Amino acid sequence: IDELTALGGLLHDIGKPVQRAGLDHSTQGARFLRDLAENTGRAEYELLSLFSEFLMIRRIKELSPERFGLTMEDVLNALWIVYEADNLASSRPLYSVFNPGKAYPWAELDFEKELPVPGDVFSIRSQDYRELVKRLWEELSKAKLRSDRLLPVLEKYLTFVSSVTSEGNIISLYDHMRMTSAIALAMLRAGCTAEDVRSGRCRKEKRFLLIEGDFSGIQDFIYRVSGKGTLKYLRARSAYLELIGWDVVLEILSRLGLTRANVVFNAGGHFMIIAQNTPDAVKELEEIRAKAVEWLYREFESDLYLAIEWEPVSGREFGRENLFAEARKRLKHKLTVRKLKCPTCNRLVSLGGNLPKLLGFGRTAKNDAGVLVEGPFSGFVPYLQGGRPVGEQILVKNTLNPGEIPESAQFVPYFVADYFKKARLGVLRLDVDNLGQAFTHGFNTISRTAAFSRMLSLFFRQHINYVLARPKLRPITGDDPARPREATIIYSGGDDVFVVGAWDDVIEFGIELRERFHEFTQGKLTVSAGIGMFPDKYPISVMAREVGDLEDAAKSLPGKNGVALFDREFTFGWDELLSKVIEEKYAFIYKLLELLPTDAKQLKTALHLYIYRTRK
Numbered sequence: 001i002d003e004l005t006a007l008g009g010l011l012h013d014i015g016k017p018v019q020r021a022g023l024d025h026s027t028q029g030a031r032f033l034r035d036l037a038e039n040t041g042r043a044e045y046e047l048l049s050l051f052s053e054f055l056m057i058r059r060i061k062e063l064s065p066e067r068f069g070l071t072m073e074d075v076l077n078a079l080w081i082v083y084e085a086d087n088l089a090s091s092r093p094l095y096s097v098f099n100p101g102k103a104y105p106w107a108e109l110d111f112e113k114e115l116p117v118p119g120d121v122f123s124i125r126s127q128d129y130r131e132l133v134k135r136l137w138e139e140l141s142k143a144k145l146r147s148d149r150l151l152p153v154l155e156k157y158l159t160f161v162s163s164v165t166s167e168g169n170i171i172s173l174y175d176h177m178r179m180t181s182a183i184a185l186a187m188l189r190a191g192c193t194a195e196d197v198r199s200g201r202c203r204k205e206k207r208f209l210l211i212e213g214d215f216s217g218i219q220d221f222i223y224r225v226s227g228k229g230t231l232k233y234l235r236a237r238s239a240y241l242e243l244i245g246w247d248v249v250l251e252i253l254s255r256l257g258l259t260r261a262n263v264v265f266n267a268g269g270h271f272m273i274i275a276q277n278t279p280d281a282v283k284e285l286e287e288i289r290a291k292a293v294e295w296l297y298r299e300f301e302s303d304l305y306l307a308i309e310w311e312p313v314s315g316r317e318f319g320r321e322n323l324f325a326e327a328r329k330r331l332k333h334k335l336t337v338r339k340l341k342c343p344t345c346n347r348l349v350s351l352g353g354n355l356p357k358l359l360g361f362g363r364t365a366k367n368d369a370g371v372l373v374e375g376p377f378s379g380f381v382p383y384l385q386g387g388r389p390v391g392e393q394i395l396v397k398n399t400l401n402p403g404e405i406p407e408s409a410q411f412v413p414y415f416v417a418d419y420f421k422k423a424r425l426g427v428l429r430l431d432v433d434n435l436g437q438a439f440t441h442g443f444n445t446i447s448r449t450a451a452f453s454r455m456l457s458l459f460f461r462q463h464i465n466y467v468l469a470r471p472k473l474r475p476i477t478g479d480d481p482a483r484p485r486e487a488t489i490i491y492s493g494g495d496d497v498f499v500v501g502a503w504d505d506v507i508e509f510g511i512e513l514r515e516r517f518h519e520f521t522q523g524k525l526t527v528s529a530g531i532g533m534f535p536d537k538y539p540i541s542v543m544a545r546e547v548g549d550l551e552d553a554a555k556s557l558p559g560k561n562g563v564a565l566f567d568r569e570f571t572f573g574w575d576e577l578l579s580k581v582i583e584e585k586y587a588f589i590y591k592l593l594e595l596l597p598t599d600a601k602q603l604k605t606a607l608h609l610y611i612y613r614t615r616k
């Protein structure tokens, strides 16, 4: 009955593409799960097809729910739980979060290295929905009937499919189904019966927890070593953090009996989970929140803290009736007051050169052989581009197919940008401006939040890799031979980016990337950046701190929309740098400096640029 509800909410809308291909959605999607049921040899799909189908009690009859382990009682419970989980989560396209008059063509979420590139209103033919169903069906046929494996098939085919073919629909059908699923699996963990649902009690009783966790002291976790620490360490030190993070999230999910579908987003080392508000959950988090802080202390004392708060909410606090934004307000407040009170250094060195051949990590007991690096509750075991995955959960890298992974192993797909090139260093720090304001008052429901939250991570977990290996702007470096950015990434996640490389590509790249960010957000968000330049061997910690000081400069600017490149206090706009510093003004220049306002600034730097393009 838990799984039934997991996949039930997951598959309730499955016939949208099936009706939108001409094979309602409740009548079509159901044949689909019956066809698939009588075409693979698992009737489970036959019983699940009923969630789409919704006479009732005699269609639950015709199928004999007890051939699994399911009382006709249990089955009606999940049919209503899921019904209203669909209502809580609240030949056309899926419009964009940012611009609601541009829209994309249904593309796949794992074909071509890309899946964006939308355009003015193009409304989708049946032929399109017919090759989609051609796939989905195959991957449905070959998948295990279990969330961890069913989620990424839906993620894969339905990301760029509209959950309701209303116009300006920002919510993809995959963010609908997950939320529907997230919410169902928790009602059920929160003991809603059909009696409660009908009475509208899963809609005013505060039956859910909105669990939220957010890391602090990351800057001082990731950046704190001196000479001892190559790019091989900084990357795996950054990787170990995601792993701490995953280890908290997967443990929360272990112990509250949930799915990855409940993970609204987990971006930046900041996470949101939807959960049953019960007292054995609250008393189960208290023990995660407490065990994991104890552990982050004993192993880093105060350098790294993870604050986890939770705020019980009602079903109508997923939507607006502005109630979601409020719950998040008290939870962000709650969250805020929750902070302010060498063998690892070496296990991470092995990792940073394994990193180029790594395909995942198995997640196991800390006392399990293979373990390279341990998190609060679990050990991790690098799954290598040679060997065989080895965990109860396997955090698989950059891809939504499990492939050569064992069954008894929750497939956990996780995206990370790692472009990396296999007289100074060029260091970028970039952070999307005021973004935690866009999330409260632009997205003020739980699905839009997940919707929006998922495109950002996409941009910083994937798209960013493509400006690195497919760069266009090059006014300093020059077009010449089509070559990628001479760079590595240390972190690209949340809304924060830290890239090292060739002094010049980095300057161009913060720009080109801000550029994409500009297009990809259609002007709707901004980024400020530090860029600094450094000799060779220097306290990474100090390259952090100084480039941080630059962005802090760029950030203390009014309107917050530029870069503070030159360590000097003379920042410019993304296209004030490009238009006037570079496209206009950029021994004689050497003496110019020794001699001694909007233009004097843009001249000041242009010369600094000119210089830097030539020394040696």
Ligand SMILES: Nc1ncnc2c1ncn2[C@H]1C[C@H](O)[C@@H](COP(=O)(O)OP(=O)(O)OP(=O)(O)O)O1
Binding pocket: 215, 216, 217, 218, 219, 220, 222, 237, 238, 239, 241, 242, 268, 269, 431, 490, 491, 493, 496, 497, 498
């Ligand atoms: N996994 C990672 N690997 C490498 N660098 C990271 C990683 N995650 C985050 N960062 C960076 C990007 C963010 O700007 C920064 C967040 O800083 P943090 O140490 O949390 O203090 P802060 O002053 O920015 O605010 P707060 O402590 O309240 O979150 O850490």
Ligand SMILES: Nc1ncnc2c1ncn2[C@H]1C[C@H](O)[C@@H](COP(=O)(O)OP(=O)(O)OP(=O)(O)O)O1
Binding pocket: 265, 267, 268, 270, 431, 432, 433, 434, 435, 436, 437, 439, 452, 453, 454, 456, 457, 493, 494, 495
């Ligand atoms: N991929 C994502 N999904 C969901 N939320 C995200 C994502 N990335 C970032 N966030 C949210 C969570 C954080 O509270 C916030 C981080 O933004 P950050 O740049 O640190 O501060 P801010 O943008 O809110 O204001 P400012 O940058 O001006 O201090 O954005």
Ligand SMILES: [Mg+2]
Binding pocket: 268, 431, 494, 495, 496
């Ligand atoms: Mg940030």
